[PDB]
Amino acid sequence: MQGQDRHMIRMRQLIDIVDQLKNYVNDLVPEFLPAPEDVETNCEWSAFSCFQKAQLKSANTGNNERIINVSIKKLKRKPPSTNAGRRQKHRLTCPSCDSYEKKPPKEFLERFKSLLQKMIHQHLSSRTHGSEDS
- Which sequence spans correspond to the domains of the chain? 1-134
User: 58, 55, 66, 133: which is closest to 98 by C-alpha?
Assistant: 55
Render 28-91 in DSSP notation, one character per residue.
-----EE---S--TTTHHHHHTHHHHT------SSSSHHHHHHHHHHHSPPPSSSSS-SSS-SS
Q: Phi/psi at 114 (nearest 5 deg)? A: -65, -55
Residue type, 67: I
The kind and range of the H/E element at 102 are: strand 102-103
- Written out in words, the top-level CATH class of the domain with range 1-134 is mainly alpha
Residue 123 and residue 120: Cα distance in Å, rounded? 5
Residue 102 and residue 121: Cα distance in Å, rounded? 24
In this structure, the number of other CB atoms found within 10 A of the CB of residue 95 comes to 10
Q: Are 68 and 56 in contact (CB under 8 A)?
A: yes
